């Protein structure tokens with residue numbers, strides 16, 4: 001969602017320099033004087049690459065299986081009265097794109113895999129005094145799932161096996177291996193695609209030690225989406241912002257998620273306010289995988305990944321400004337043993353992001 005991309009999303013739940021954050025922590029609403037609006041997008045360009053071979057001897061190599069993506073974000077925030085404020089946003093919190101050929105040998109465990117999420121958020125917060133503040137949010141999730149699968153060298157495998165058995169010596173015995181082996185890769189073995197809505201509620205608590213230092217604890221509820229039933233995980237997060245100097249600040253957060261398996265994310269970053277116009281941000285983060293070294297899938301790319309980030313912010317003048325963010329993710333090369341297959345998945349990625357914000 002913009003600036004956050006250049007800070008590796010470090011302390012997203014305590015930073016308040018632009019309305020983007022309210023969607024991450026509703027309590028942060030009591031942090032804005034005048035209505036603020038921000039919009040933009042993040043262009044996502046991956047590089048997932050499966051490798052290795054099959055017991056069929058056929059290649060299980062698949063270059064670039066993760067498509068590019070453009071992700072929009074739009075946040076609006078405004079005060080109501082000295083003790084209340086409200087806000088809305090349109091973003092995306094989950095997704096996933098994977099595409100192999102339909103003739104791929106592991107076609108059964110790696111056909112087409114799409115999943116887009118649109119989160120519609122509305123929420124409010126109440127300021128309890130100079131220090132504490134609290135927020136509650138409702139969420140609308142539009143999910144579009146697409147899941148294709150074929151039988152790669154499956155019939156061959158079935159067949160080669162048979163050929164190692166007595167039924168080998170004919171009598172509808174060899175005709176068998178043949179019939180199995182005479183099965184096309186592109187023989188679609190699974191096509192489920194649908195659209196449905198999800199509903200969840202998130203909340204937050206914002207504690208500030210002063211206009212220069214604050215901490216937080218946010219909570220994101222699980223969201224079940226029924227088509228097959230897809231569950232977006234519930235989340236917990238703690239973040240801190242320290243305005244250590246007029247020109248230097250620090251932000252960091254620890255996030256926890258339990259996919260009813262579980263994983264965590266850690267990020268630390270620092271911004272620098274050179275002057276009234278310019279602002280600079282750097283960030284590092286690591287998100288530990290929620291999937292056991294044996295329950296992975298070349299289909300769903302994820303794996304202990306790291307993040308390097310850098311963003312900049314030009315303020316045209318007191319009311320408006322634009323954010324530009326860069327972010328590179330490198331992935332730990334792993335070993336997957338899905339089905340009768342065994343692959344190897346590497347994958348890095350680049351993120352470009354821009355956002356313009358305006359005050360009324």
Ligand SMILES: CCCCCCCCOCCOCCOCCOCCO
Pocket residue numbers: 001042044046066067069071092093094095096097098301329349
């Ligand atoms: C390799 C993908 C990196 C995912 C991080 C993007 C970070 C920002 O937020 C995105 C939020 O919403 C959904 C993401 O897009 C779908 C995933 O990319 C497709 C590759 O399989």
Ligand SMILES: CCCCCCCCOCCOCCOCCOCCO
Pocket residue numbers: 238250252253254266267268
């Ligand atoms: C010493 C300066 C670095 C700032 C970190 C202080 C943050 C202290 O710990 C908070 C513990 O709970 C949340 C997350 O972990 C901290 C941030 O990650 C740091 C480097 O990987």
